[PDB]
Amino acid sequence: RDEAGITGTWYNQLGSTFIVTAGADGALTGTYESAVGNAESRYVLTGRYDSAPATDGSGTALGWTVAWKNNYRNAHSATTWSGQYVGGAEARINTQWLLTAGTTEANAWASTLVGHDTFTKVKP
Amino acid sequence: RDEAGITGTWYNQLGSTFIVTAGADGALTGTYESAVGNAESRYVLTGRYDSAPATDGSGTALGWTVAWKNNYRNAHSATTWSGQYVGGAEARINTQWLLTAGTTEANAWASTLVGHDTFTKVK
Amino acid sequence: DEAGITGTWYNQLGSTFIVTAGADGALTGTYESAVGNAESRYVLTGRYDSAPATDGSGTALGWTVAWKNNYRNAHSATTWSGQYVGGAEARINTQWLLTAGTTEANAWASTLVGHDTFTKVK
Amino acid sequence: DEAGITGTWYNQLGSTFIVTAGADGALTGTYESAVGNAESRYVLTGRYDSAPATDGSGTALGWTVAWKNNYRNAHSATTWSGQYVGGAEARINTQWLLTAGTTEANAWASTLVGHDTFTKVKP
Known part of the structure; x- marks a missing residue:
């Protein structure tokens, strides 16, 4: 388990904030605030x-979703981050993400942005 | 919303089976079986x-994650699907996905597959 | 194959891909987007x-369009990465990335991703 | 940006990208992967x-390598899509798609996705 390692506050290269708890049976729960x-x-x-990664120095695979609706705004969109947690002095979560917006069928070719976010336990 | 429309069993082009409950608060929960x-x-x-999409006939944005560990197997990997639900007679969830495996730092450039899955109510 | 790839292709959106495949491994031609x-x-x-596996695997390929011509400039470029699969029902199965020139601030939102399947008839 | 793009570039893995930007929007060159x-x-x-915006935006570009030469054939191709940013920190920021030739059964796992940043300084 990297339950210890993953749980807590993370920051990406944009200044976004990712607060997460890793449960014992593989769950990730929390909140995301985008810059x-x-x-x-x-x-x-x-x-x-x-929850049971390889102990061979490989990272720990994870992913999470945010739908961009809350008590303020609704961007009619959702992002999924897919990546791996890497332990060490400077722990890191290296991700790629897909951001899909609800579109009409004629616009659906342009529904999905792709990018990459690196998270550290210390802000930039 | 599409709580009723999304809740149920979906099949992708590979024969994979997505069983999902859409909650009133915007949650998705369920099981995935990959073929x-x-x-x-x-x-x-x-x-x-x-849970409160546009009414201009846009799709409903959604996403979900599977970590490929269960009682039977562990592939040390996770997929996320990002996409949109389109309701109607031929309801569809159109997705793109990222599958990341845990890798060493030397193999990290090769950690992530990308693909696309279209889900339908009937195989 | 050279001659199997050479020719006119159409995707699911009604776009037109006209390509010649050189013996040197080159792809050249024109793209019309719907x-x-x-x-x-x-x-x-x-x-x-230009020398693929013989085990029934497809043939890897990729190409770029920068969206500038004599009529229009969209300050963007698409790359298609995929494989050609021969046979009665010949296909080029691709995924693509479309990046627009952006400011540094908006760079997180620079790139769309999608998938196009090309066939020999519309 | 023709003079600015033309040159020898290195990514964060130490791969070498030698490119010439033509007048007519062409990129031609060689790539060596680390x-x-x-x-x-x-x-x-x-x-x-070859005629970008004048508003501080980057220059959009893309290129393809098929991984066949006289030494090796990986039956695969990579495309990089990104933008050139001029000036102080001269940079090409890209995302890439690496597709292998596969059987139809394995086509779901045909494509890797990643990101490469290129600078004229070898790290």
């Missing part, structure tokens, strides 16, 4: 992680 | 959807 | 595996 | 926006 886009304050996130 | 890769039986999934 | 900030034909260039 | 099933230099071709 960019059509977003204000905290959004619910849920995800999953590998 | 492909290093997987057997059901895996837990959790995700979110837009 | 959607987005585009009109008329655009130059494309790419590469393909 | 990782995967690769040896020596491979032909690349691509395109860039």
Whole structure:
């Protein structure tokens, strides 16, 4: 388990804030606050992680989702982050993400942005 | 919202089976069974959807995650699907996905597959 | 194969992909997009595996269009990465990335991803 | 940006990208990968926006390598899509898709996705 390691507050290269708890049976629960886009304050996130990773120095696979609706705004969109947690002095979660917006069928070719976020326990 | 429309069993183009409950608060919970890769039986999934979508006939944005560990197997990996639900007679969830495996730092450039899954109510 | 790839292809959106595959592994031709900030034909260039596996695998390829021609400039570029699969029902199965020139501030939102399947008839 | 893009670039893995930007929007050159099933230099071709915006935006570009040369054939191709940012920190920021030739049964796992940043300084 990297339950110890994952749980807590993380920061990406944009200044976004990711607060998460890793449960014992593979759950990720928390809130996400984005520094960019059509977003204000905290959004619910849920995800999953590998609770029994390989002990061979490999990272721990995880992922989570945010739907960009809360008590402030609704951006009619959702982001999934897919990546791995890497332990050590400078712990890191390296991710790629997909951000899909609800579109009409004629616009659906342009529904989905892709990008990458690196999270550290210390802000930039 | 699409709570009723989304809740149920979905099948993708590979024969994979998505069983999902959409909650009133925007939650998705259920099980995923992959017909492909290093997987057997059901895996837990959790995700979110837009519980108050646009009414201009847009899709409903959603996403979910599966970590590929259950009682039977552990593939040391996780998939996320990001996409949108389109309701109607031929209801569809159109998704793109990222599958990341735990890797060493030297192999991290090769950690993440990308693909697309289209889910339908009937196989 | 050279001649199997060479020719006119159509995707699920009604776009038109006209390509010649060189013996040197080159792809050259033109792309006409049915959607987005585009009109008329655009130059494309790419590469393909000119000596693929013989075990029934497809043939890897990729190409780029920058969305500038004599009519329009959308300050963006698409790359398609995929594989050609021969046979009665010949297909090129691709995923693509479309990056627009952005400011540094908006760079997180620079790139769309999608998937196009090309066939020999519409 | 033709003079600015033209040159020898290195990514964070130490791969070498030698490119020439043409007047007519062409990119031509060689790529040498520090990782995967690769040896020596491979032909690349691509395109860039030869008349970009004047508003501080980057220059959109992309290129393709097929991983066949005289030394090796990985039966795969990578495309990089990104933008050139001029000036102080001269940078090409890209995302990439690496597709292998696969059987139809394995086509779900045909494509890797990643990100590479290029600078003229070898790290």
